[PDB]
């Protein structure tokens, strides 16, 4: 209700 | 010699992730080149041959190096690849290729989606040309959405990941939905990679002039292009940079989108950066936090 949390990743090569 | 002509390709296949017909970019995710090659007899040490891939995709996403992996027979380099303009990959075969007989090769490469050139969700034709022989992939991009509330929403992107010089690029676009938001605080953190001994990052603030419909749900921001953002950062006593990469920044009406581009180092020794953005606003307090985080694969 108050805080919400999220995310991601980017893929590349090495 | 350019000896194209002398390129067969005997199996040619692109494949979405984990062999499915779909590809989340945003969830690390990449598509796969595969090629059996035959050649010709007869070829020379510095003769060439091309393919070129669609402009959706290319062969580095994040990373800054521009690489293709070698084409071997055992641990024998029959020839070496470079990434050239417009889609391009060319291979310049060594020495070993010389009165050899019969030679056939595999090649896999990892295809990365362009959050510049797919901007939004739908079906993408990947293909890879050779020698006129079209390699052909329909595969469903999907993005995520960022972390909203009823006040606003958060999301980045890792822009650009230079292993070399130990470097990365990043960008958060701090867009507020319904109601009025004040007094925004906006802080972005390394929680890995972190150089307690190093430089302050260059953050650069822009408000985004465009309308919200037509923010890349890629993530994508041209922050060159000065009709769509207008950068703010001189105009923003408001700005805290820290010399273990961290910022703080206070934004006072949230008004209109704001785009923060990051550019800093982190420490050597490190696989992969996470970068942390936060944001704290007050209606008229709530906290969206966003990670971004790499997956980097090998060819």
Redesign the interface.
């Known amino acids: 209700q108050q805080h919400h949390l999220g995310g991601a990743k980017q893929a590349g090569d090495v | 010699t350019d000896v194209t002509s002398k390129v067969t390709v005997e199996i040619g296949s692109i494949e979405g992730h984990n062999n499915t017909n779909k590809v989340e970019?945003?969830?690390?995710?990449?598509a796969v080149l595969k090629y059996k090659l035959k050649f010709e007899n007869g070829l020379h040490q510095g003769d060439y041959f091309d393919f070129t891939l669609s402009n959706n995709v290319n062969?580095?996403?994040?990373?800054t190096?521009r690489?293709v992996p070698e084409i071997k027979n055992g641990s024998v380099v029959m020839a070496t690849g470079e990434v050239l303009e417009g889609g391009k990959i060319r291979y310049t075969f060594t020495n070993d290729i010389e009165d050899k007989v019969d030679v056939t090769a595999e090649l896999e490469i990892?295809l990365?989606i362009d959050p510049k050139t797919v901007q939004t969700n739908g079906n993408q034709t990947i293909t890879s040309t050779l020698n006129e022989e079209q390699t052909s992939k329909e595969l469903d991009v999907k993005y995520?959405d960022?972390?909203?509330?009823y006040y606003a929403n958060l999301n980045?992107?890792?822009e650009t990941?230079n292993?070399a010089n130990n470097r990365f690029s990043h960008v958060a676009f701090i867009k507020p939905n319904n109601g009025k938001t004040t007094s925004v605080t906006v802080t972005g953190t390394l929680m890995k990679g972190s150089n307690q001994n190093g430089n302050q990052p260059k953050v650069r603030i822009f408000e985004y002039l465009g309308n919200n419909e037509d923010i890349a749900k890629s993530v994508y921001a041209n922050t060159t292009d000065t009709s769509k953002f207008k950068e703010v950062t001189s105009n923003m006593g408001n700005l805290n940079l820290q010399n273990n990469g961290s910022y703080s920044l206070n934004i006072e009406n949230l008004d209109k989108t704001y785009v923060v581009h990051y550019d800093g180092e982190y420490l050597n020794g490190t696989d992969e950066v996470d970068f942390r953005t936060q944001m704290v606003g007050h209606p008229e307090?709530?906290?969206?936090?966003?990670?971004?985080?790499?997956?980097?694969?090998?060819?």
């Open positions: 970019p945003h969830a690390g995710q990449r062969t580095h996403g994040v990373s190096a690489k990892n990365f995520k960022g972390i909203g509330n980045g992107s890792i990941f292993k307090g709530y906290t969206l936090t966003w990670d971004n985080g790499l997956v980097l694969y090998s060819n």
